[PDB]
Amino acid sequence: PIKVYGQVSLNDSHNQMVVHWAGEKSNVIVALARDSPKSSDVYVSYDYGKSFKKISDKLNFGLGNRSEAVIAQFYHSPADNKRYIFADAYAQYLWITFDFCNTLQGFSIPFRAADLLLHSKASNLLLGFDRSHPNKQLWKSDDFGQTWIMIQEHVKSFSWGIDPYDKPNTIYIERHEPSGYSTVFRSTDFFQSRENQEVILEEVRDFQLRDKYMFATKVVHQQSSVQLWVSFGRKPMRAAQFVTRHPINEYYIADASEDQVFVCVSHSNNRTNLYISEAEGLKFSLSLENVLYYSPGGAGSDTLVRYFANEPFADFHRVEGLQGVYIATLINMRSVITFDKGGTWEFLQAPGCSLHLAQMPILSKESAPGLIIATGSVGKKTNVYISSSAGARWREALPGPHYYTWGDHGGIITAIAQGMETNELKYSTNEGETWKTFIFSEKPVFVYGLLTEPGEKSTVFTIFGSNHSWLILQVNATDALGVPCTENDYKLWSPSDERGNECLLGHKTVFKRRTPHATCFNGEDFDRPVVVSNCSCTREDYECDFGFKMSEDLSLEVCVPDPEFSGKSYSPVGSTYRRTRGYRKISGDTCSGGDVEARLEGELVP
Ligand SMILES: *[C@@H]1O[C@H](CO)[C@@H](O)[C@H](O)[C@H]1NC(C)=O
Ligand SMILES: *[C@@H]1O[C@H](CO)[C@@H](O)[C@H](O)[C@H]1NC(C)=O
Numbered sequence: 323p324i325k326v327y328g329q330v331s332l333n334d335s336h337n338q339m340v341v342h343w344a345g346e347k348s349n350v351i352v353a354l355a356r357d358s359p360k361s362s363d364v365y366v367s368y369d370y371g372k373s374f375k376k377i378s379d380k381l382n383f384g385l386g387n388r389s390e391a392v393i394a395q396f397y398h399s400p401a402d403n404k405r406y407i408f409a410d411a412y413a414q415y416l417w418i419t420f421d422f423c424n425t426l427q428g429f430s431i432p433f434r435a436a437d438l439l440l441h442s443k444a445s446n447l448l449l450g451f452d453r454s455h456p457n458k459q460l461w462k463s464d465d466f467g468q469t470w471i472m473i474q475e476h477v478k479s480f481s482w483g484i485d486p487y488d489k490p491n492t493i494y495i496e497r498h499e500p501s502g503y504s505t506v507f508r509s510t511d512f513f514q515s516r517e518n519q520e521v522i523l524e525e526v527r528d529f530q531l532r533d534k535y536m537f538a539t540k541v542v543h544q545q546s547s548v549q550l551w552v553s554f555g556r557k558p559m560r561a562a563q564f565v566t567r568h569p570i571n572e573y574y575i576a577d578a579s580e581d582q583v584f585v586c587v588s589h590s591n592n593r594t595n596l597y598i599s600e601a602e603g604l605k606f607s608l609s610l611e612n613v614l615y616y617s618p619g620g621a622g623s624d625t626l627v628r629y630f631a632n633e634p635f636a637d638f639h640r641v642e643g644l645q646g647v648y649i650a651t652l653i654n655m656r657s658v659i660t661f662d663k664g665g666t667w668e669f670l671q672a673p674g675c676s677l678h679l680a681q682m683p684i685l686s687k688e689s690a691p692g693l694i695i696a697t698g699s700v701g702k703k704t705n706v707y708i709s710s711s712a713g714a715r716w717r718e719a720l721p722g723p724h725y726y727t728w729g730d731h732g733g734i735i736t737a738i739a740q741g742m743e744t745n746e747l748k749y750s751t752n753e754g755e756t757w758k759t760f761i762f763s764e765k766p767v768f769v770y771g772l773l774t775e776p777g778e779k780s781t782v783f784t785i786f787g788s789n790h791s792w793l794i795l796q797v798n799a800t801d802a803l804g805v806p807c808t809e810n811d812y813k814l815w816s817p818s819d820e821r822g823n824e825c826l827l828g829h830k831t832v833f834k835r836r837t838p839h840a841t842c843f844n845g846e847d848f849d850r851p852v853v854v855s856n857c858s859c860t861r862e863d864y865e866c867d868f869g870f871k872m873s874e875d876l877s878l879e880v881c882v883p884d885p886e887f888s889g890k891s892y893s894p895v896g897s898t899y900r901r902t903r904g905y906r907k908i909s910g911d912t913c914s915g916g917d918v919e920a921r922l923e924g925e926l927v928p
């Protein structure tokens with residue numbers, strides 16, 4: 323029903339191992355073994371993981387130099403999955419391949435390659451940032467790392483532009499300056515001429531680019547305070563309004579991907595406050611207080627929080643595949659979820675008790691709309707919890723901590739116990755309502771990774787671990803799904819909140835998906851909603867207005883005046899101006915008509 327078709331032990335005793343399939347239409351897998359750096363090894367499969375060949379000896383410093391290569395990091399081009407760069411940890415040196423590591427060539431380079439930033443569309447183009455010097459130099463290559471020019475020195479921060487919003491080759495940069503105040507510049511010819519260069523904002527402290535938005539900071543006064551500046555869709559930057567009684571030291575941009583900005587301000591007692599804007603990103607309202615926040619700390623002069631997306635400091639998580647849905651943890655903790663980008667929040671429940679989600683991460687994808695797997699616990703021992711209702715309802719799927727992944731649009735889910743040795747793969751074809759066991763090897767292993775072969779329809783899983791000696795297995799589970807799904811095996815589904823509203827963000831979205839109990843191969847792409855239709859407005863289409871905050875008791879769902887406004891939340895006796903009741907329609911909400919829209923919307927006042 324399921325078979326292990328590839329199993330390979332690498333006579334290798336490094337303490338880290340990463341394994342990456344080249345991509346969806348590809349038989350190549352690259353594996354990199356590293357320490358915690360003291361040594362490394364590289365292995366490549368050209369047969370879907372049936373066999374791996376050691377190719378570390380191809381990574382050498384050339385004729386008459388025998389000193390061993392030590393790979394810190396490798397990089398895969400997202401524009402061309404045949405291309406890789408392996409960077410030496412110590413020497414100023416790279417190896418590049420254009421053919422899945424069949425041929426590698428070494429190149430000595432004028433900096434150590436701490437961080438390379440490969441362009442997402444132009445496969446020859448990349449940046450390199452020399453972080454070892456305090457001299458802070460940005461290097462650019464247009465031949466995939468063979469030759470490099472130094473395009474900017476004294477770099478405080480920089481970023482590639484983003485398509486489609488920026489012209490081709492766009493780079494944004496800000497330099498360190500003796501005064502501490504600096505200019506954000508944009509160039510389309512790598513800073514080679516005045517004519518292809520543009521001032522974006524001046525007297526800036528920091529800057530960041532995130533999707534359609536750009537953020538920068540200035541200082542105002544009389545204690546000084548940091549003012550946030552924002553651009554939406556590459557229009558000129560404008561000052562955001564953040565009214566508080568006390569100085570703001572920094573902003574954390576938590577998310578800017580759904581036509582609004584979530585921003586966190588303050589980090590007292592490992593808590594922060596979550597604010598949301600409308601589309602322009604300029605008028606923020608307090609959506610959620612006391613969100614868990616843990617950072618390692620920084621030098622003390624950062625005004626925009628730097629962090630990696632896969633390691634957010636705020637316990638706040640966008641659910642993929644769905645607009646509107648985010649999950650957070652607040653504080654004696656509680657997990658909450660929103661279905662309307664922070665307009666209202668609800669407590670998560672399992673069978674009911676309060677469900678607390680440790681964010682082992684939350685797994686969700688556009689290829690399986692409404693399916694979420696997460697790790698957490700109930701009351702007061704971690705288990706695996708599953709929702710197939712976009713987080714509205716949850717069940718406990720498996721007890722104990724596990725790796726989990728899935729294939730074929732969520733139609734087959736796999737799980738392996740973590741933190742103990744095992745030779746057991748759990749699999750479910752019904753969203754975790756039942757599970758079968760497949761013994762994937764005779765002897766137990768500590769498992770360190772569980773992956774799905776890329777491709778939305780894939781039903782091949784990679785397992786790697788050891789008992790130190792690395793083992794890599796490939797499990798083909800295709801036959802566990804049997805024959806192709808037919809019309810009988812699909813049902814219409816609309817995401818809803820916990821109350822049953824299938825009307826989210828002012829419209830009803832309809833997906834065609836495979837029923838929970840159908841055992842069949844789903845060969846269809848139904849990732850994109852079949853029907854969308856508008857609804858009459860409800861409370862759920864509204865959020866707190868500038869000057870207001872969510873009631874402390876979230877279940878009241880009432881917006882009240884924010885004390886930070888010092889009693890001036892409602893300030894303008896003439897004409898017919900529009901006085902807010904505390905609410906504004908959520909950015910991108912398409913609701914229309916009905917009772918609620920009236921007297922949630924502003925009041926006409928003389
Ligand atoms: C070999 O060449 C590399 C890269 O140029 C250099 O960094 C290293 O010092 C060399 N090692 C020896 C033993 O000559
Ligand atoms: C897995 O099994 C299916 C059905 O037998 C086959 O079509 C598919 O190519 C296999 N995949 C791999 C990577 O062996």
Ligand SMILES: *[C@@H]1O[C@H](CO)[C@@H](O)[C@H](O)[C@H]1NC(C)=O
Pocket residue numbers: 854855856911912913
């Ligand atoms: C729903 O409303 C939006 C504007 O709010 C409009 O653009 C869209 O055409 C409407 N869609 C449907 C399917 O009626």
